[PDB]
Design an enzyme around this catalytic site. Structure first.
Site, PDB file in Angstrom:
ATOM      1  N   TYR A  72       0.813  -1.194   0.000  1.00  0.00           N
ATOM      2  CA  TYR A  72       0.000   0.000   0.000  1.00  0.00           C
ATOM      3  C   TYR A  72       0.861   1.265   0.000  1.00  0.00           C
ATOM      4  CZ  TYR A  72      -3.579   3.466   1.237  1.00  0.00           C
ATOM      5  OH  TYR A  72      -4.338   4.604   1.213  1.00  0.00           O
ATOM      6  N   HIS A 111      -4.846   5.196  -2.828  1.00  0.00           N
ATOM      7  CA  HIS A 111      -6.049   6.005  -2.993  1.00  0.00           C
ATOM      8  C   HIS A 111      -5.622   7.329  -3.600  1.00  0.00           C
ATOM      9  CE1 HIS A 111      -7.616   3.173   0.012  1.00  0.00           C
ATOM     10  NE2 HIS A 111      -8.783   3.347  -0.614  1.00  0.00           N
TER      11      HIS A 111
HETATM   12  C1  LIG Z   1      -0.384   7.530  -2.832  1.00  0.00           C
HETATM   13  C2  LIG Z   1      -0.354   8.984  -3.201  1.00  0.00           C
HETATM   14  O1  LIG Z   1       0.373   9.788  -2.694  1.00  0.00           O
HETATM   15  S1  LIG Z   1      -1.635   9.430  -4.327  1.00  0.00           S
HETATM   16  C3  LIG Z   1      -1.234  11.146  -4.628  1.00  0.00           C
HETATM   17  C4  LIG Z   1      -0.063  11.176  -5.595  1.00  0.00           C
HETATM   18  N1  LIG Z   1       0.751  12.355  -5.355  1.00  0.00           N
HETATM   19  C5  LIG Z   1       0.301  13.582  -5.590  1.00  0.00           C
HETATM   20  O2  LIG Z   1      -0.677  13.801  -6.297  1.00  0.00           O
HETATM   21  C6  LIG Z   1       1.053  14.703  -4.924  1.00  0.00           C
HETATM   22  C7  LIG Z   1       1.241  15.863  -5.872  1.00  0.00           C
HETATM   23  N2  LIG Z   1       1.751  15.425  -7.164  1.00  0.00           N
HETATM   24  C8  LIG Z   1       3.031  15.096  -7.376  1.00  0.00           C
HETATM   25  O3  LIG Z   1       3.913  15.251  -6.531  1.00  0.00           O
HETATM   26  C9  LIG Z   1       3.388  14.594  -8.763  1.00  0.00           C
HETATM   27  O4  LIG Z   1       2.691  15.379  -9.727  1.00  0.00           O
HETATM   28  C10 LIG Z   1       3.229  13.077  -9.058  1.00  0.00           C
HETATM   29  C11 LIG Z   1       3.768  12.235  -7.887  1.00  0.00           C
HETATM   30  C12 LIG Z   1       1.773  12.680  -9.321  1.00  0.00           C
HETATM   31  C13 LIG Z   1       4.049  12.771 -10.318  1.00  0.00           C
HETATM   32  O5  LIG Z   1       5.482  12.763 -10.113  1.00  0.00           O
HETATM   33  P1  LIG Z   1       6.431  13.562 -11.099  1.00  0.00           P
HETATM   34  O6  LIG Z   1       7.820  13.660 -10.600  1.00  0.00           O
HETATM   35  O7  LIG Z   1       5.955  14.915 -11.543  1.00  0.00           O
HETATM   36  O8  LIG Z   1       6.353  12.610 -12.382  1.00  0.00           O
HETATM   37  P2  LIG Z   1       7.310  12.039 -13.528  1.00  0.00           P
HETATM   38  O9  LIG Z   1       8.174  13.070 -14.079  1.00  0.00           O
HETATM   39  O10 LIG Z   1       8.107  10.888 -12.976  1.00  0.00           O
HETATM   40  O11 LIG Z   1       6.162  11.582 -14.565  1.00  0.00           O
HETATM   41  C14 LIG Z   1       6.128  10.305 -15.243  1.00  0.00           C
HETATM   42  C15 LIG Z   1       5.035  10.303 -16.286  1.00  0.00           C
HETATM   43  O12 LIG Z   1       3.743  10.458 -15.658  1.00  0.00           O
HETATM   44  C16 LIG Z   1       2.867  11.183 -16.514  1.00  0.00           C
HETATM   45  N3  LIG Z   1       2.429  12.395 -15.821  1.00  0.00           N
HETATM   46  C17 LIG Z   1       2.931  12.898 -14.649  1.00  0.00           C
HETATM   47  N4  LIG Z   1       2.454  14.076 -14.324  1.00  0.00           N
HETATM   48  C18 LIG Z   1       1.566  14.365 -15.347  1.00  0.00           C
HETATM   49  C19 LIG Z   1       0.741  15.481 -15.605  1.00  0.00           C
HETATM   50  N5  LIG Z   1       0.703  16.572 -14.831  1.00  0.00           N
HETATM   51  N6  LIG Z   1      -0.041  15.445 -16.711  1.00  0.00           N
HETATM   52  C20 LIG Z   1       0.011  14.367 -17.504  1.00  0.00           C
HETATM   53  N7  LIG Z   1       0.762  13.267 -17.376  1.00  0.00           N
HETATM   54  C21 LIG Z   1       1.526  13.329 -16.270  1.00  0.00           C
HETATM   55  C22 LIG Z   1       3.634  11.465 -17.815  1.00  0.00           C
HETATM   56  O13 LIG Z   1       3.359  10.523 -18.844  1.00  0.00           O
HETATM   57  C23 LIG Z   1       5.069  11.435 -17.300  1.00  0.00           C
HETATM   58  O14 LIG Z   1       6.035  11.169 -18.335  1.00  0.00           O
HETATM   59  P3  LIG Z   1       6.695  12.382 -19.171  1.00  0.00           P
HETATM   60  O15 LIG Z   1       6.950  13.533 -18.147  1.00  0.00           O
HETATM   61  O16 LIG Z   1       7.938  11.867 -19.832  1.00  0.00           O
HETATM   62  O17 LIG Z   1       5.575  12.838 -20.168  1.00  0.00           O
HETATM   63  C1  LIG Z   2      -3.947   1.296   7.312  1.00  0.00           C
HETATM   64  N1  LIG Z   2      -3.272   1.869   6.190  1.00  0.00           N
HETATM   65  C2  LIG Z   2      -4.021   2.069   5.080  1.00  0.00           C
HETATM   66  O1  LIG Z   2      -4.274   1.216   4.225  1.00  0.00           O
HETATM   67  C3  LIG Z   2      -4.495   3.436   5.019  1.00  0.00           C
HETATM   68  C4  LIG Z   2      -5.825   3.763   4.902  1.00  0.00           C
HETATM   69  S1  LIG Z   2      -5.948   5.474   4.832  1.00  0.00           S
HETATM   70  C5  LIG Z   2      -4.255   5.644   4.935  1.00  0.00           C
HETATM   71  C6  LIG Z   2      -3.604   7.024   4.856  1.00  0.00           C
HETATM   72  C7  LIG Z   2      -2.876   7.159   3.507  1.00  0.00           C
HETATM   73  C8  LIG Z   2      -3.905   7.823   2.590  1.00  0.00           C
HETATM   74  N2  LIG Z   2      -3.240   8.337   1.398  1.00  0.00           N
HETATM   75  C9  LIG Z   2      -3.912   9.086   0.464  1.00  0.00           C
HETATM   76  O2  LIG Z   2      -5.107   9.315   0.526  1.00  0.00           O
HETATM   77  C10 LIG Z   2      -3.031   9.589  -0.651  1.00  0.00           C
HETATM   78  C11 LIG Z   2      -2.132  10.717  -0.191  1.00  0.00           C
HETATM   79  C12 LIG Z   2      -2.862  12.033   0.024  1.00  0.00           C
HETATM   80  O3  LIG Z   2      -2.459  12.845   0.845  1.00  0.00           O
HETATM   81  N3  LIG Z   2      -3.992  12.197  -0.829  1.00  0.00           N
HETATM   82  C13 LIG Z   2      -4.825  13.380  -0.703  1.00  0.00           C
HETATM   83  C14 LIG Z   2      -4.249  11.353  -1.941  1.00  0.00           C
HETATM   84  O4  LIG Z   2      -4.766  11.748  -2.971  1.00  0.00           O
HETATM   85  N4  LIG Z   2      -3.885  10.031  -1.730  1.00  0.00           N
HETATM   86  C15 LIG Z   2      -4.499   8.872   3.537  1.00  0.00           C
HETATM   87  N5  LIG Z   2      -4.488   8.227   4.863  1.00  0.00           N
HETATM   88  C16 LIG Z   2      -4.727   8.898   6.070  1.00  0.00           C
HETATM   89  O5  LIG Z   2      -4.274   8.614   7.171  1.00  0.00           O
HETATM   90  C17 LIG Z   2      -5.627  10.052   6.043  1.00  0.00           C
HETATM   91  C18 LIG Z   2      -6.891   9.945   5.450  1.00  0.00           C
HETATM   92  C19 LIG Z   2      -7.737  11.061   5.442  1.00  0.00           C
HETATM   93  C20 LIG Z   2      -7.328  12.264   6.044  1.00  0.00           C
HETATM   94  C21 LIG Z   2      -8.222  13.443   6.016  1.00  0.00           C
HETATM   95  N6  LIG Z   2      -7.852  14.673   6.431  1.00  0.00           N
HETATM   96  N7  LIG Z   2      -8.923  15.471   6.172  1.00  0.00           N
HETATM   97  N8  LIG Z   2      -9.888  14.714   5.606  1.00  0.00           N
HETATM   98  N9  LIG Z   2      -9.472  13.427   5.508  1.00  0.00           N
HETATM   99  C22 LIG Z   2      -6.060  12.351   6.642  1.00  0.00           C
HETATM  100  C23 LIG Z   2      -5.203  11.242   6.646  1.00  0.00           C
HETATM  101  N10 LIG Z   2      -3.612   4.503   5.042  1.00  0.00           N
END
Ligand SMILES: CC(=O)SCCNC(=O)CCNC(=O)[C@H](O)C(C)(C)COP(=O)(O)OP(=O)(O)OC[C@H]1O[C@@H](n2cnc3c(N)ncnc32)[C@H](O)[C@@H]1OP(=O)(O)O
Ligand SMILES: CNC(=O)c1csc([C@H]2C[C@H](NC(=O)[C@@H]3CC(=O)N(C)C(=O)N3)CN2C(=O)c2ccc(-c3nnn[nH]3)cc2)n1
Length: 153
Positions: A72, A111
């Site tokens: 995860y 997520h």
């Molecule tokens: C579990 C989680 O945390 S879910 C939430 C994910 N994180 C976030 O959304 C936090 C804010 N966003 C970010 O930090 C970034 O935009 C991330 C993590 C989504 C992407 O990481 P980056 O360093 O910008 O991506 P990276 O350069 O490695 O991109 C790889 C490919 O993804 C795709 N991609 C990435 N960003 C974009 C974008 N804005 N629009 C379209 N395609 C995209 C492209 O195909 C890209 O390849 P290319 O740049 O050669 O065209």
């Molecule tokens: C048991 N472990 C699991 O399986 C598990 C299940 S939830 C979890 C963790 C990781 C999860 N990560 C994401 O949602 C990512 C990263 C991100 O920041 N966002 C926005 C996104 O797009 N995706 C959020 N979460 C929280 O603790 C969390 C969830 C909601 C709020 C909140 N605050 N105000 N309203 N709601 C704050 C914290 N872990």
């Protein structure tokens, strides 16, 4: 080769950097327990450096649910001016490489807040699919809905 991007371990010496990066990057807050847990996950948590500048991080945990071993991804991201440079790819490749080397994971999931078009596009490039849309996943932020993205291994 010649890369300006490197990943490093998270430790008690640099955890404050991870917390600051997560505070700026994510619209939700994580508690002391999340960071204490990050210090115990080893390779499942990493800081990403651009020219030795801490600019992103990835934090994962092993999830045992649906009678499966699942990886995860909790947080994965990098500061806005450093995006589209390969930092996200380097962090995601690291987590896919742990899974391939280990060989006991059924899948990898996360997520994504439904408004995050950039993150969906990013993950779909690596073979992740939208398997579900969970309504009211986030308590205090809008939109509250989250997609569940999963890659099968
Ligand atoms: C579990 C989680 O945390 S879910 C939430 C994910 N994180 C976030 O959304 C936090 C804010 N966003 C970010 O930090 C970034 O935009 C991330 C993590 C989504 C992407 O990481 P980056 O360093 O910008 O991506 P990276 O350069 O490695 O991109 C790889 C490919 O993804 C795709 N991609 C990435 N960003 C974009 C974008 N804005 N629009 C379209 N395609 C995209 C492209 O195909 C890209 O390849 P290319 O740049 O050669 O065209
Ligand atoms: C048991 N472990 C699991 O399986 C598990 C299940 S939830 C979890 C963790 C990781 C999860 N990560 C994401 O949602 C990512 C990263 C991100 O920041 N966002 C926005 C996104 O797009 N995706 C959020 N979460 C929280 O603790 C969390 C969830 C909601 C709020 C909140 N605050 N105000 N309203 N709601 C704050 C914290 N872990």
């Amino acid at each position: 080769k010649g890369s300006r991007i490197e990943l490093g371990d998270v430790t008690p010496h640099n955890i404050k950097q991870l917390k600051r990066l997560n505070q700026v990057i994510f619209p939700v807050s994580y508690n002391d327990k999340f960071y204490k847990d990050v210090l115990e996950v080893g390779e499942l948590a990493k800081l990403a450096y651009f020219n030795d500048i801490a600019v992103g991080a990835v934090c994962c945990r092993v999830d045992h649910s649906q009678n499966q071993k699942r990886l995860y991804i909790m947080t994965l991201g990098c500061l806005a001016p450093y995006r589209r440079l390969g930092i996200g790819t380097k962090m995601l490749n690291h987590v896919l490489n742990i899974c391939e080397k280990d060989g006991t994971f059924d899948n990898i999931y996360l997520h994504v807040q439904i408004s995050n078009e950039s993150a969906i596009d990013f993950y779909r490039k690596f073979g992740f699919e939208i398997i579900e849309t969970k309504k009211n996943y986030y308590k205090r932020i809008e939109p509250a809905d989250a997609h569940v993205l999963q890659k099968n291994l």
